[PDB]
């Protein structure tokens, strides 16, 4: 089982304070929660519960989520790490933290983005819209990777947009968690679409690079415009999806190289697949929306050993986004 380290950012959390990454120890200060009226009810997320509410203390609009009872540890994870990207480009920021009268559980209330479903607007991004919102993802993933700081949940669903304003912010920090070298971390993240290559192999030494396939994946379902690109019905079937595309010689090496044995069960549902070219992907309805540079960034993102992908930064500085204004 041969480990690996990130390539960048590598030991940002080692040398800052131990108050920083150590969420355990740290003291939540609560505000007044009378200073908030709910107003109906956005999502009921299983592990938590969404709602618009407002702050009477200047009529604006905000958005608490009382989190649900599992695990003091996963909360303060999460608070602290809202606190710490307090403030960074696109990244929802944290406006207050009250205790709930009725459930007893801290309620965090964040400002306030309007965003459409995801179903009905990137499906109507144009290339440009899709190369301009794409930079602004990176500028959030960067920022909290530079943090020391993986997301771990990259979808669509997390990202909200205010198309109007052209405003995004990646939002729902549930599943962040700190990177420490060498740390060994639970596969059990992410929504099955998104899962990387290491999560689905059963490779716990993960870092930033994880959220970079994440983010080809919502790439590579807006210019190809399939909604998921890998639809897997499961996890095992997940990992054989994104092998007819990627093939399994590739799959080998990744797992020949870190040393890492499937388990046999995905020996005996894989087969043999050739990697194919992506422009098999391309037809009538997507053509206006690929370009080589835009396969070129898309194959960098996508690669089963995570060392290989693009880092946020170097994603940052990619001919794809030469387009892109400032």
């Not at 897997?232 to 990627?246: F, T």
Request: a neutral charge; hydrophobic letters at 35%.
């Amino acid at each position: 089982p041969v480990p690996s380290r990130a390539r960048v950012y590598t030991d940002v959390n080692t040398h800052r304070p131990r108050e920083y990454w150590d969420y355990a120890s740290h003291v939540v200060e609560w505000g007044n929660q009378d200073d908030y009226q709910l107003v109906r009810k956005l999502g009921r997320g299983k592990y938590s519960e969404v709602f618009e509410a407002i702050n009477i203390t200047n009529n604006e609009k905000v958005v608490v989520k009382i989190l649900k009872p599992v695990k003091k540890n996963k909360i303060k994870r999460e608070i602290k790490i809202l606190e710490n990207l307090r403030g960074g480009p696109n990244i929802i920021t944290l406006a207050d933290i009250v205790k709930d009268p009725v459930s007893r559980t801290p309620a965090l209330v964040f400002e306030h983005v309007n965003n459409t479903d995801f179903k009905q607007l990137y499906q109507t991004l144009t290339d440009y819209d899709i190369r301009f919102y794409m930079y602004e993802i990176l500028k959030a993933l960067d920022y909290c990777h530079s943090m020391g700081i993986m997301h771990r949940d990259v979808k669509p669903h997390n990202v909200m947009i205010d198309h109007e304003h052209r405003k995004l912010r990646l939002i729902d920090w549930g599943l962040a968690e700190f990177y420490h070298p060498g740390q060994e971390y639970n596969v059990r993240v992410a929504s099955r679409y998104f899962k990387g290559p290491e999560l689905l192999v059963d490779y716990q030494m993960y870092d930033y690079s994880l959220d970079m396939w994440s983010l080809g994946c919502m790439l590579a379902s807006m210019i190809f415009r399939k909604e998921p690109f890998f639809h897997g019905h499961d996890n095992y079937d997940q990992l054989v999806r994104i092998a007819k595309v990627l093939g399994t010689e590739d799959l080998y090496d990744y797992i020949d190289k870190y040393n890492i044995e499937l388990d046999p069960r995905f020996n005996d549902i894989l087969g043999r697949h050739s990697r194919k070219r992506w422009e098999r992907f391309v037809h009538s309805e997507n053509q206006h929306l690929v370009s080589p540079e835009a396969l070129d960034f898309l194959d960098k993102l996508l690669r089963y050993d995570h060392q290989s992908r693009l880092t946020a930064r170097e994603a940052m500085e990619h001919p794809y986004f030469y387009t892109v204004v400032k």
